[PDB]
Amino acid sequence: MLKYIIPTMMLMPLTWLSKNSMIWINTTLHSLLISLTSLLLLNQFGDNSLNFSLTFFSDSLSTPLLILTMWLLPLMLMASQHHLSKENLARKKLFISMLILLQLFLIMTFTATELIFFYIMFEATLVPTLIIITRWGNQTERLNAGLYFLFYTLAGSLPLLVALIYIQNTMGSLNFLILQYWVQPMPNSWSNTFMWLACMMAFMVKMPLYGLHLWLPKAHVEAPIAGSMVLAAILLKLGGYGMMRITLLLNPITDFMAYPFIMLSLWGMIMTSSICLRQTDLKSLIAYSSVSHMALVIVAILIQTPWSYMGATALMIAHGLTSSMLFCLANSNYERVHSRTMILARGLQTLLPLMAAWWLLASLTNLALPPSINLIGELFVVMSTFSWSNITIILMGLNMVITALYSLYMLITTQRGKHTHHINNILPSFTRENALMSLHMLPLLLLSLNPKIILGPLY
């Protein structure tokens, strides 16, 4: 793994001692070289996980998320100009280097052996995105956005530290094999319930669940595109992967104590699909869409079936791709017209004639068009939850109906029917945005061809 880590450190002074009108090509070129290098990772086989010696390993769950992350980085690094392509050279290098350091802590967080190393790199993943969205948030409440962001994520993520030091100093070291291979079932005390509540509630904050979901939408609509896509995709699915790690312990008590979290997740999935049917501020609809899909993920994690884990990881990776794409489209529309609202800039079927195809393809992979990976994830989650209970399928299909409803309402609202003929400033599409579209939707359909990769450790 350190051969997949140290060129990211050596990629940092590339941006510094690359001169003017030259940083862009060098950063994009070498991050794509890193994408090939990480595409060379996939070797994992059969019985065990793949150890990258003593500090590191990878399950077949961290591997697709890691390859997704290092593929998502050049997409973002090309995505993040035209709102800072006219700013200063030193601040531009600082921005790009902060993105690279952010990627470095993302890979550090996904490739962890010990949960203490995982927690340090977890809040190391936290800290740069704060600076990025607060400095370039481009709206008058980005202060409140970053403030709620850091305070919710620390104030929830903090008792996880105490619980992990407790598991450190009562049951040996914290290898995942040695957290495995040795864990005795801890019975139903109340202290076990508090420790389970600490760990699971910290990652509940990071998902978010329904009771803590207003963490998200300000930190998307008052944030630039780079921090938005990193935030949504890698941070929410990073919290999901963290719970997928830590849920191996405490099995005889999660049955008795995991009923209300399933409950808040289901009812919040329904109410969040309802809340993003009517709003303006187009950027926020994808944020509440992400809240709905992550509530579905949390139902899938807290029931403990291998079918549920396969559907969980498929839904994670497919929704990461879909949400990152659809955020990039909303960025393109806001760069066209500086409104951020929904009812104003209609039309756009006449003009931007092939951008409509990308809105269509993004809204249909958000619709769960059935050969895509998104319906694979949602389908196996529905199968496992109907095995869990015989009556929850009404809530799942009700989510499905309203999800199709708001996604296709987003499609036929902003880009269907009538130009308001006072806009009269938008230019036709650049090759850069369409290049980002072809960066988005070719890996999703290629994974739809060969999906035996992204299914989890319980393949």
């Binding site: 409440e141 209300p260 399933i262 409950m263 009812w267 303006t280 501020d281 496992s384 209970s389």
Partner: protein, 64 residues
């Protein structure tokens, strides 16, 4: 822009917590949640007691 600023960020100011708003929030927020939680308790009690009796159709019930 006046409508958007009234609709998005002018919700929380202004506000006073009254009897009507509190009763409506507790009627729409915890009510149906404890309803679905009671019916999940009911269905899970039935399934637990039935498969503890063992009279389930699990001649082949593999994909759990």
């Amino acid at each position: 822009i006046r409508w958007t600023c009234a609709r998005s960020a002018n919700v929380y100011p202004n506000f006073r917590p009254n009897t009507k708003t509190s009763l409506l929030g507790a009627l729409f927020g915890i009510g149906p949640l404890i309803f679905w939680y009671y019916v999940f308790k009911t269905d899970r009690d039935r399934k637990e007691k039935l498969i503890q009796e063992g009279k389930l159709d699990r001649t082949f019930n593999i994909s759990y």
